[PDB]
Design a protein around this ligand. Structure first.
Ligand SMILES: Cc1cn([C@H]2C[C@H](O)[C@@H](COP(=O)(O)OP(=O)(O)O)O2)c(=O)[nH]c1=O
Ligand SMILES: Cc1cn([C@H]2C[C@H](O)[C@@H](COP(=O)(O)OP(=O)(O)O)O2)c(=O)[nH]c1=O
Ligand SMILES: Cc1cn([C@H]2C[C@H](O)[C@@H](COP(=O)(O)OP(=O)(O)O)O2)c(=O)[nH]c1=O
Ligand SMILES: Cc1cn([C@H]2C[C@H](O)[C@@H](COP(=O)(O)OP(=O)(O)O)O2)c(=O)[nH]c1=O
Ligand SMILES: Cc1cn([C@H]2C[C@H](O)[C@@H](COP(=O)(O)OP(=O)(O)O)O2)c(=O)[nH]c1=O
Ligand SMILES: Cc1cn([C@H]2C[C@H](O)[C@@H](COP(=O)(O)OP(=O)(O)O)O2)c(=O)[nH]c1=O
Ligand SMILES: [Mg+2]
Ligand SMILES: [Mg+2]
Ligand SMILES: [Mg+2]
Ligand SMILES: [Mg+2]
Ligand SMILES: [Mg+2]
Ligand SMILES: [Mg+2]
Lengths: 133, 133, 133, 133, 133, 133
């Protein structure tokens, strides 16, 4: 039994894909443990969430985008939930995300990619404490 | 523009229809303005929410059901959101709800009926203040 | 609790709508109690099923159509299953069936209309005994 | 057999509902007989199409909207295609369109209402000649 | 042209996924040759079906589960139907089943995995004779 | 930013999958630049489109099939659209097309495979000029 942190990103709201994305995780039988809606996430929370990317050239564009619209943060719970939800998510790169995955079916940009999911046990605990302190 | 208060009821979680219900409202182009996940709503908020029914025969069963599992409270915003979302919802009575509506398509009980929606401008304001003080 | 008799008609097989139709009933929370696949229903069961129509102008065409491909006979169970499933089904006449209903959404002919559902408690009992003796 | 003229309006493109709308008509078993994609319809065809409204208060806004993005013009064919597709479409007014219909499920504005469908045999013939001379 | 044996397992019934699963195979254009509904399969039929697993530690839990609710057995027919339906099915292990497959989208347990499909020509003939003697 | 040429093949029309296929590309956020409906494509256009296959044993059966019903030709535009739409398409061979892809979910024949998509930059320019001279 693991908990992972999911963000529904502003592009999901703009494109009306919130339910589509949440439904894919719901149908896989993962349960919501916590959920928070953000009309606009504070930029500092975004910078902490993406602290590992602070020196990447895309960091500021990434942060601008993540504050461009609403976000839903969700803690999902289930056996091996972290790796399983990552697999549903699909690869970051639109050249690689597989059809059948969320990004593979729905995303067409490396930045505007609809959804975040924690990539490891270590980062799950981290991100959960950022969004649900 | 109006805002209306929607509850996603515990039967929706039980039957994995949370995204299905939210998706129907999303596809109608209504926007989430506020949202709260409750692992178990406090009985007092429930009795307040349904205060008009407090002397009805079904009141205790209704309150019991509403705390029997998680709920999501959502404020939706759009032109004539109250009446329009009531129409999507469908009649309380499974003998009356029209196919095409949430309850008409998905609910088969007068109590376990998946979704609450505010029925008027005043009750909307009222319910919004209960779930989002 | 009632039980009603449903037939999935040969046009549903032809048009690959078998799961679509069964799915609408399933999502309404009705339970399969009995089920039979017929690669070709015996003409005699069909004439019995539709005995009320035996003197109508359309009778032979109706019987011919009903043996023109496979059918599935299903007994569904739930509260007020008969009337409720009739409502999902929709009007026989394509000029009358409401969007949201099976026929309203999917059928475009008064004969090739995808689904049979028992129309009363007595006809349900009757039809159930024909298809599941 | 009748033929009717359908326009998929620019809001459908904006909201990525082109296939959703065409799919509802396709599932009803109506056949495309003619089809034209317009990156931007010529204003003159639009004013001709809506000539009956030329003196109405909303005319300029309607014409402006109709050239604000792409449209698809389609001629559909089937028994009673005109009235049947009008029924799928739903009422122009978002306070009136029934869930189950295209507009009832998907539109939330009296102007930005996703789809045009010919309203009579004569207007069908008329509109067909405008979009497919 | 091959025939393969599919079981819709009790968890599909509990979770109301019967049509969803059958629809996926139907949409791939496989035809039903035989179909049998079982309110509860006899435990001995289950033990024969899984005779190859008799010495596995999960054998009794597996059999208990397979008699815990209804089952539908289906013989599907089509070119290379055995391998193709296996690929739609997805891997047994929730850590491996690919999004886009039945288990990959819908199953989250190695035991409660919704669907059985024969794994070879040799086992297809075998299983078909168990369920359709 | 690339443009690729897509054909919706006659089997999509016969099976009523036109919207399903177009919707998959639409949901991935690709935009239509040009679209042409063909009640029946001229055989010579088909032979040019498939000129690379002229010496294959399946060439004449392929051409017969492509003129057996309507076709929609579409020019889609987007970043890396050629390779991305190929990946959504899925492999030609029903033994290999992956679930989640168009062919993987929907096609069951190596010839009747629903959709063409240009395989390279060189062939995109070529095919676009054949269908949209
Ligand atoms: C690698 C990369 C990421 N990003 C953005 C989008 C990613 O969701 C976010 C974090 O990157 P990363 O953690 O690599 O992606 P993922 O979300 O798949 O774990 O940074 C870019 O905008 N451009 C890039 O090249
Ligand atoms: C009228 C009624 C309501 N209820 C429950 C279900 C309703 O969702 C809740 C409030 O009733 P009500 O406000 O009448 O219905 P709605 O939810 O359609 O606005 O009380 C019953 O259980 N039995 C009943 O007879
Ligand atoms: C009334 C009628 C029925 N039929 C066929 C189609 C009906 O499904 C079948 C039985 O008719 P009926 O019991 O009146 O319709 P329903 O199936 O809605 O209960 O007979 C015709 O072909 N033409 C007709 O005019
Ligand atoms: C009546 C009306 C129409 N319109 C626009 C939207 C309609 O699609 C278009 C033509 O009106 P109309 O033909 O009355 O509606 P429909 O599209 O349902 O046949 O004009 C308005 O913007 N406001 C209005 O009050
Ligand atoms: C391998 C395995 C199977 N099972 C159950 C679920 C499987 O559907 C069933 C048969 O196993 P197997 O034939 O290996 O799986 P599949 O259904 O993918 O062909 O046994 C377990 O409960 N635990 C296990 O570790
Ligand atoms: C390879 C092959 C193709 N075809 C037909 C179907 C293909 O869509 C068409 C062109 O072949 P090809 O370009 O190899 O396939 P794709 O469409 O995946 O790029 O020729 C056959 O009928 N049989 C075959 O063995
Ligand atoms: Mg990461
Ligand atoms: Mg109320
Ligand atoms: Mg009848
Ligand atoms: Mg009009
Ligand atoms: Mg096996
Ligand atoms: Mg090719």
């Amino acid at each position: 039994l693991q908990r992972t942190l999911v963000l529904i990103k502003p592009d999901a709201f703009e494109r009306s894909l919130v339910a589509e994305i949440m439904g894919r995780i719901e149908k896989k039988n993962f349960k919501i443990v916590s959920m928070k809606f953000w009309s606009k996430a504070p930029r500092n929370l975004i910078e902490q969430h993406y602290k590992e990317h602070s020196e990447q050239s895309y960091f500021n564009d990434l942060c601008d985008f993540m504050v461009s619209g609403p976000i839903i943060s969700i803690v999902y719970e289930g056996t091996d939930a972290i790796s399983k939800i990552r697999r549903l998510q699909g690869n970051t790169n639109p050249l690689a995300s597989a059809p059948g995955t969320i990004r593979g079916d729905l995303a067409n940009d490396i930045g505007e990619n609809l959804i975040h999911a924690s990539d490891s046990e270590d980062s799950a605990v981290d991100e959960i404490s950022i969004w649900f302190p």
